[PDB]
Amino acid sequence: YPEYVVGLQWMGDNYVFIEGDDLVFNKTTRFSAADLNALMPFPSFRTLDAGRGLVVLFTQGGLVGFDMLARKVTYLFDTNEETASLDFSPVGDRVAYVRNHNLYIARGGKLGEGMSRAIAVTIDGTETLVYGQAVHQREFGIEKGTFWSPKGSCLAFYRMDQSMVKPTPIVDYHPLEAESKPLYYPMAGTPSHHVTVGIYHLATGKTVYLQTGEPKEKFLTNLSWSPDENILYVAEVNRAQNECKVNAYDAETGRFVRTLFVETDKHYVEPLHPLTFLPGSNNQFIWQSRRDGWNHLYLYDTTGRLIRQVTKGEWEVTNFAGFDPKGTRLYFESTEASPLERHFYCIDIKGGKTKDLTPESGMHRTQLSPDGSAIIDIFQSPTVPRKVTVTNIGKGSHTLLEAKNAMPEIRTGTIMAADGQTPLYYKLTMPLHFDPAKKYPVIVYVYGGPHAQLVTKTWRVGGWDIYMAQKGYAVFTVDSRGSANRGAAFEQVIHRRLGQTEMADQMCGVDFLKSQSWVDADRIGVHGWSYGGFMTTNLMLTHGDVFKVGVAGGPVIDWNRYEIMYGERYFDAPQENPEGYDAANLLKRAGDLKGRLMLIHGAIDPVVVWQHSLLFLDACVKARTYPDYYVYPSHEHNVMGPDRVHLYETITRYFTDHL
Amino acid sequence: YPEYVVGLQWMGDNYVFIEGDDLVFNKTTRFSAADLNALMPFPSFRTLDAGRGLVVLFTQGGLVGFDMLARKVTYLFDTNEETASLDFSPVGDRVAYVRNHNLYIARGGKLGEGMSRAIAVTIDGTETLVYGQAVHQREFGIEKGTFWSPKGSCLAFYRMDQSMVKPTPIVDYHPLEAESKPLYYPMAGTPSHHVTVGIYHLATGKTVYLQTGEPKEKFLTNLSWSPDENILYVAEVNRAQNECKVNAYDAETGRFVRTLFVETDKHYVEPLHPLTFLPGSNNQFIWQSRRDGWNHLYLYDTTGRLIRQVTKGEWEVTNFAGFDPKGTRLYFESTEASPLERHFYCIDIKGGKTKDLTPESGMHRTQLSPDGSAIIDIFQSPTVPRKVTVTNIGKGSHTLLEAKNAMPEIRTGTIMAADGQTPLYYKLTMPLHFDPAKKYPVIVYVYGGPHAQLVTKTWRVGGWDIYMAQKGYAVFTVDSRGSANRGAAFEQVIHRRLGQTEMADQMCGVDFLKSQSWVDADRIGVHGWSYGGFMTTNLMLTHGDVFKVGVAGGPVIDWNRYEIMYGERYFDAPQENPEGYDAANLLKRAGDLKGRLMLIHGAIDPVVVWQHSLLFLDACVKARTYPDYYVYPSHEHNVMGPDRVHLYETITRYFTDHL
Ligand SMILES: *[B]([O])([O])[C]1[C][C][C]N1C(=O)[C]([N]C(=O)[C]([C])[N])[C]([C])[C][C]
Numbered sequence A, B: 001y002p003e004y005v006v007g008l009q010w011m012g013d014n015y016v017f018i019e020g021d022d023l024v025f026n027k028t029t030r031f032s033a034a035d036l037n038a039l040m041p042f043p044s045f046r047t048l049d050a051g052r053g054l055v056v057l058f059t060q061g062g063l064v065g066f067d068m069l070a071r072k073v074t075y076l077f078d079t080n081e082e083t084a085s086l087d088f089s090p091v092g093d094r095v096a097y098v099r100n101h102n103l104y105i106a107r108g109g110k111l112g113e114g115m116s117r118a119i120a121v122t123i124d125g126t127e128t129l130v131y132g133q134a135v136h137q138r139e140f141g142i143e144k145g146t147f148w149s150p151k152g153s154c155l156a157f158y159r160m161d162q163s164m165v166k167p168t169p170i171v172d173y174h175p176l177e178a179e180s181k182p183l184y185y186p187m188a189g190t191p192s193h194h195v196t197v198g199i200y201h202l203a204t205g206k207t208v209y210l211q212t213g214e215p216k217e218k219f220l221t222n223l224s225w226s227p228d229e230n231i232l233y234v235a236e237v238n239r240a241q242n243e244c245k246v247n248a249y250d251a252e253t254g255r256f257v258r259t260l261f262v263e264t265d266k267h268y269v270e271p272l273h274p275l276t277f278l279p280g281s282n283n284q285f286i287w288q289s290r291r292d293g294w295n296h297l298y299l300y301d302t303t304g305r306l307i308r309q310v311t312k313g314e315w316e317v318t319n320f321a322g323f324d325p326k327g328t329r330l331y332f333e334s335t336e337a338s339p340l341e342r343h344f345y346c347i348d349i350k351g352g353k354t355k356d357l358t359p360e361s362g363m364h365r366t367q368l369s370p371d372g373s374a375i376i377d378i379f380q381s382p383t384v385p386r387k388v389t390v391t392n393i394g395k396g397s398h399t400l401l402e403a404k405n406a407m408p409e410i411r412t413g414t415i416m417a418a419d420g421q422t423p424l425y426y427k428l429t430m431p432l433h434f435d436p437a438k439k440y441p442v443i444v445y446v447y448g449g450p451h452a453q454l455v456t457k458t459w460r461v462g463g464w465d466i467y468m469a470q471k472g473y474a475v476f477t478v479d480s481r482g483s484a485n486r487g488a489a490f491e492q493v494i495h496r497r498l499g500q501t502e503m504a505d506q507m508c509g510v511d512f513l514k515s516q517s518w519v520d521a522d523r524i525g526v527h528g529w530s531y532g533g534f535m536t537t538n539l540m541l542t543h544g545d546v547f548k549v550g551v552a553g554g555p556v557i558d559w560n561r562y563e564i565m566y567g568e569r570y571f572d573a574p575q576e577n578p579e580g581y582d583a584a585n586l587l588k589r590a591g592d593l594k595g596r597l598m599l600i601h602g603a604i605d606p607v608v609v610w611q612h613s614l615l616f617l618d619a620c621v622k623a624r625t626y627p628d629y630y631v632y633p634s635h636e637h638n639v640m641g642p643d644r645v646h647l648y649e650t651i652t653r654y655f656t657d658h659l
């Protein structure tokens, strides 16, 4: 992004993209918005079924399903205005959605055959009882709360009772009188919500619940249906997050059938992906697992027997793309070439050697065709803005677009972590018009938390580094330990001790900066958002002689006030780890603020609740220290859209005023 | 304040004060804390009855009534920990208070005679139904909600149904999860709360309500009992606030008896004081009124006939102190000598000439003895820090304490208002070490709203001006039109047009500043709190070429979000005055912010709700302008106590950084 070839994707055996008013098909044909409009009763659509080229069009009056290969309307759907929770049946003729707390199924209507009223699956949804939506704070790969069986006979869905969770107020300041709504945000160490899984059987209109049993707090993750629809598999994770049991439940009655396998960890287990069945098989599936230190693909049968670890090595699978039609090969993205890069690979289901299908050094983003016969590859590197190719697998490529190259120079390299052994990768955005004779102020842009990696081999953070460098400030970033795509041992060093290693590694970044002659060692600043706001603030309080100025956005300040699921994975529960929580609790060290720090929060932030930065200002008042503040009353966790211009101006002016 | 002679006051025919461990009596005797302690079953006390020297002591285990003239314990009271709402019977042997939403009366227990359970006057108090407390947002002189009859036979009290008022959330951020409480703050133009007056008769335990009738929104103010306890008088003010009817109600049945008199005004009527009966009379009383342009004392009889305007002139009575024993003279404080000064006077009840009893130029604060025979006077002026005298009236004074005089020079003078006719008084705090050869930045400290007057002839704002001047910044203040103690016409020019005249007068202040050679006209700032925060912000947006930097604390930003009672008096209702509200609505002009402005708010401010400054930051985001912010999460409208040091440091550093 930015997208040079709009909507580039597979439809049947054609790759497809938009060109203003046309939709262009190739294996060439065009389809105009006028051609299309004539068929209604180039616009935006959601692809439902790439293999069959079925999409849905969001229009003036409900949804219009459309077949792009046949060039024919499929169904019109009426979801009473609901679009966010839309989940279409794999059969393509029904859609589940949530409206006013309850789960519904709507049936599509064929062109001029009249409509039917939607079915209410649930009727007692409310504030404290949530149906059909993501649960467990969207941890464990959970992004939604509806799971159609693969032949469309059944709809599994979450039911979340959060009546035992003490809510946080989220205040809307726009009405005449401000209006508060409870957010049922379960904080570390507190009673969790109670999720159960229902299955609604369309033929009979019966609902059964899985008998997942006790404890009621157990995390029910990665729902995966058997291809024959008889079993619903669930990866269940305990409160300690050190055990994951993959269990089979009977879809008809809800009864527990068997435990397939159990994974455990010294620190935490974290399942993130569903079971994926082999093509044409009801008995074998791929499961992703980081159990050996590295995310890899495992071949299981459905009794729970492990056939083979299919991928292996000191590198990680970062996206599983699927199979060849016969199910004899796996396709996937990984870090095998470099953790700074992403390539697409093939491997035999029997394992052994990977074959890189996108060998150019840099970042490949790749889409395997419904065939399993070809790929779209989108490529960028420090020297290549965008290279979009289409390859018939092992039959030569065809380039579809290639982009050609005063701006800030970007330098990259490696420094040693604080253990003196682990290498860390860094990027350094140099002042515009950099003159090596001169001294320059510099800003550490830090994130440093799990699941993110900021330094990759890409077409050279959303460009805040560039803007700052245009103002004469170098910006440095290093992926310290805790960060992603470097295997588990590299990440899990932070367990029970948030901030400690991360800061020690960032101070290696500062040691490097200070080795540079052109760095003004007395003008070093720090900026980050979220976990990076936690880090910015911790760094100013911990290394006040070094960091003169920071801006911390949406910062975690007190981890006891972060959510149970993410928080307790990396930190354990507060009652189990008082020493670690206390060391990371920035409220306790507010008196050590001696530089200039601005905190920024969205007022309606439901991720890092506003309370975090407010209590920090409060602690500073008592401690007699002097931070600055800005609040975005209409924003949540991140400032999004045009208002991001105001954000960038506020942050950079703070630095140009004070650093 | 600071208090040089601690607790200085009348007790019987003695004036009294504390000296560490003694309470010293004079007309000399001492009473030690050890003498006192021996009598319990020099400390802090509340005087209940100065004439009889009866006080109450707040102790470890309930309240102890004590007679200071007799040196004997009166009663012990058990009010289950409640102290804020305490209202003692004039008989001295019972106390009303509010606990858990309900009104109670407790009977005092004589030393070693055992206690009795308190009487519950009400039992259905809750969140939306308030008993025994101030109502109508404490406007109209209302400071409490209990009114004992003067012989203690009855207790009148307010009942406020606020179930029709849409509340504002007030959030406590200190618990693990933040906790919101509704504040039933009725905003301009919205449905007001419904107040009725109950009277509880102690002999029978019966409660009757006054039949105050419709509209239910009417303001019931300045409750005043007849000395014979048969009638309860109420000053009733309509929603428009341009009519006040003083009505008599039968205390026994609640029935309406008669309207005594009606006052009306072109702009607003504002009754602020109770009826005060002549000594020994049930038929004549003094009523304060600003009806002729100036606050004066009127002599009425109880049918409603006006006997005489007793005081008159182009000056205002600022405190009515009472009568001589015979009720032939009035004692009171006024502005007759100068609006910049306060003197104590005598006048014949027949009127005519005032006699100044405290003729020295400056500020006198005066207490008339229970006799009506003598005064304590506390005096300060620009040259006199503190002069404390005691005069036997018209029989020569006795001085009791006289205080003796690098610091910022304070200059004072007069400039013309923007009409070119009305004089305005100003004070100017000069930089420390002021050098007339030099140029200095200067800050307008502005308040500018009704009911306040910042420039008086005093021992030279809580000293923020001095601190700023120590940092090299001159501070200027001018009492613009709208401000207090200059009669109604001077105030009421702002009616329906908040900010407009006030700003035009403050810009005369700036014209004066710019006439000074030692003023750096390019380094002019502005600071104020509350109405002064409204003014600071309006000035920056209205005169952005002049005011480079401001700090606005607890600012009103949108008057539609200010309370019905204060707001609609000066502005009328929003539906009646859209042009005036729109002109004062700072949200509409956020795009005109071109200087540096910090807003500061207490998060739990129940006067100017936090929403005001938050919506201003929000409007600035949209408008692309760049204010700064600080929030005090544990503070209400003003930052109080030691945290005020943090406040002063934040505000002054903002100026030293940017102005
Ligand atoms: B942030 O860094 O954006 C925020 C605070 C620390 C972790 N975090 C997250 O947003 C994580 N998500 C969740 O906590 C979800 C909402 N449970 C991110 C980084 C994904 C792991």
Ligand SMILES: *[B]([O])([O])[C]1[C][C][C]N1C(=O)[C]([N]C(=O)[C]([C])[N])[C]([C])[C][C]
Pocket (backbone or CB within 6 Å): B136, B137, B138, B139, B449, B450, B451, B529, B530, B531, B532, B556, B563, B565, B566, B607, B608
């Ligand atoms: B402030 O100036 O402290 C605030 C905003 C404008 C008026 N105001 C007040 O505090 C007034 N009191 C009330 O509004 C009461 C609470 N109804 C003061 C100035 C007394 C008139």
